Amino acid sequence: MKLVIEGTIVLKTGMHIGGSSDFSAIGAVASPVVRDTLTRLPLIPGSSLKGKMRYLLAKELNNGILLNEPNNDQDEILRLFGSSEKDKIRRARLKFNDIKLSNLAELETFNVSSTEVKFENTINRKTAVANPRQIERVIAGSKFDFEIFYNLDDIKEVEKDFENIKQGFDLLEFDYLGGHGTRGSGRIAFENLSVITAVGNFEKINTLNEILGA
């Protein structure tokens, strides 16, 4: 059958993510945040969430060090995120989605736009002159209601896979999600994590909703 992992990415700091390499204006914001083209909502790409979550979970399940190609991670990490070896191809169970901004209306109640322009520079240490930059971050405290599908191929491995899913979610809470992360941004948190089956009824869904509910 098919499962659905749905929750909320709430930002604790700015989280600049995505971008365009296009020449932004003379006075401008440079490297804007990635957006949905239609709604002009700020966006979390599903690729960015998958790549960062896979990297942290691959580093932790190794353990500690991780210095290989993405194709030959641990077999747990292959069986969640996928693999493209020559004879050991492993299909991805998880399927991430592009994540639009969830609480735009609540951010409108405070009468703030959903994104901010952060002012930054660097000081050239030989010459002590400043190199100003503007970057477009999402504002903090904004939510992102996601939805991750999970293939269910083996019934004896779903508890271990959802343990690793919750572990990747917990490890991502102590890192950033994109952009200038170590310079004070990118910090996210996961809220209201739960599992709902797509169609049908599951006999062992209480323990998955209990692993992901705590």
Cβ(176)–Cβ(189) below 8 Å: no
Angle of CA points 54, 60, 62, to nearest 5°: 100
Cis amide bond preceding 63, omega within 30: yes
Shortest Cβ distance from residue 208 to its own copies (Å)? 17
C-alpha dihedral sign at 52, 57, 60, 64? negative
Give the Cα separation of 198 and 59 in Å (integer): 31
Q: Which is nearer to its own copies, 32 or 162 (CB)?
A: 32
In the complex with other proteins, the residue whose CB is nearer, 174 or 214, is: 174
End-to-end CA distance of the chain: 24
Minimum CB separation from its own copies for residue 98, in Å? 4
148: Cα within 13 Å, side-chain hemisphere = 29
Q: Which uninterrupted H or E stretch holds 105? A: helix 104-109
Residue 68 contact among its own copies, other proteins, none, beta carbon within 5 to 8 Å by kind: its own copies
Amino acid at 125: R
Give the residues lining the site for other proteins (CB under 8 A): 2, 4, 18-23, 25-29, 32, 34-40, 45-47, 50-51, 82, 84, 86-87, 89-92, 94-98, 110-115, 117, 134, 136, 149, 151, 153, 198-199
The least distance separating its own copies from the CB of residue 210, rounded to whole angstroms, comes to: 19
Nearer to its own copies, 124 or 206 (CB): 124
Which of the choices its own copies, other proteins, none does residue 28 contact, using the CB cut-off of 5 to 8 A by kind? other proteins
Using CA atoms, how far residue 7 sits from 87, 143, 176, 185, in Å, is: 35, 10, 17, 21
Q: Which does 57 bind (CB under 5 to 8 A by kind): other proteins, its own copies, none?
A: none
Given its own copies, other proteins, none, residue 164, with its beta carbon under 5 to 8 Å by kind, binds none
The nearest distance, CB 84 to its own copies, in angstroms, is 9
The distance of closest approach from Cβ of residue 212 to other proteins in the complex, given in angstroms and rounded to an integer, is 18
Output the smallest distance, CB 214 to other proteins, in A. 25
* Distance between CA atoms of residues 25 and 2, nearest Å: 46
Tokens of 56: 């942290």
Q: Which does 32 bind (CB under 5 to 8 A by kind): other proteins, its own copies, none?
A: other proteins
